[PDB]
Amino acid sequence: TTTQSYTNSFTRGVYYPDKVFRSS
Amino acid sequence: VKNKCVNFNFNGLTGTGVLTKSNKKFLPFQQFGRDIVDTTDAVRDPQT
Amino acid sequence: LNRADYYVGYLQPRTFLLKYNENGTITDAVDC
Ligand SMILES: *[C@@H]1O[C@H](CO)[C@@H](O)[C@H](O)[C@H]1NC(C)=O
Ligand SMILES: *[C@@H]1O[C@H](CO)[C@@H](O)[C@H](O)[C@H]1NC(C)=O
Ligand SMILES: *[C@@H]1O[C@H](CO)[C@@H](O)[C@H](O)[C@H]1NC(C)=O
Numbered sequence: 001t002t003t004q005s006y007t008n009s010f011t012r013g014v015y016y017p018d019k020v021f022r023s024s
Numbered sequence: 025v026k027n028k029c030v031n032f033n034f035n036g037l038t039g040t041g042v043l044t045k046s047n048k049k050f051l052p053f054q055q056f057g058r059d060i061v062d063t064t065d066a067v068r069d070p071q072t
Numbered sequence: 073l074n075r076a077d078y079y080v081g082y083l084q085p086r087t088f089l090l091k092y093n094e095n096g097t098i099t100d101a102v103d104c
Contacts, residue, residue, distance in 0.1 A: 002078075007079065011100075013083070014088070014090070014098060014101045016053075019053050019056075020056065020057055021048050021049070021050050021051075021066060022058070022092040023093070023094050023095075024094055048096070049097075054096065
């Protein structure tokens, strides 16, 4: 079986939107 | 021709300028490339 | 098979501001 507890994600789940190098 | 101003047609992307060695930490997925004003500044030669 | 996970979230259309580091890497991001 399984459970369905809840959990805060905080600052998480950010990916590079595209493939362009960026600095500063 | 890494040091002489040249008209380039890199993968359809036409333009004019010079090409010199670069240490840009282009992680292995970064391609066209750009700058702060988002203007193509560093193209990783696709062949090399 | 043979012989504490499953963390799922749903993304949404949002505007983000992302802080890039000198080596092309994402150090911090803030949800506007
Ligand atoms: C094409 O480029 C890749 C990456 O530089 C290289 O490993 C490969 O040998 C090249 N293929 C030919 C046929 O030149
Ligand atoms: C399943 O059991 C076989 C037999 O001992 C073993 O070789 C294999 O690595 C096992 N697979 C896993 C996922 O543990
Ligand atoms: C960028 O990468 C270089 C090489 O790994 C490293 O020496 C340097 O500390 C990095 N800079 C930052 C700000 O993390």
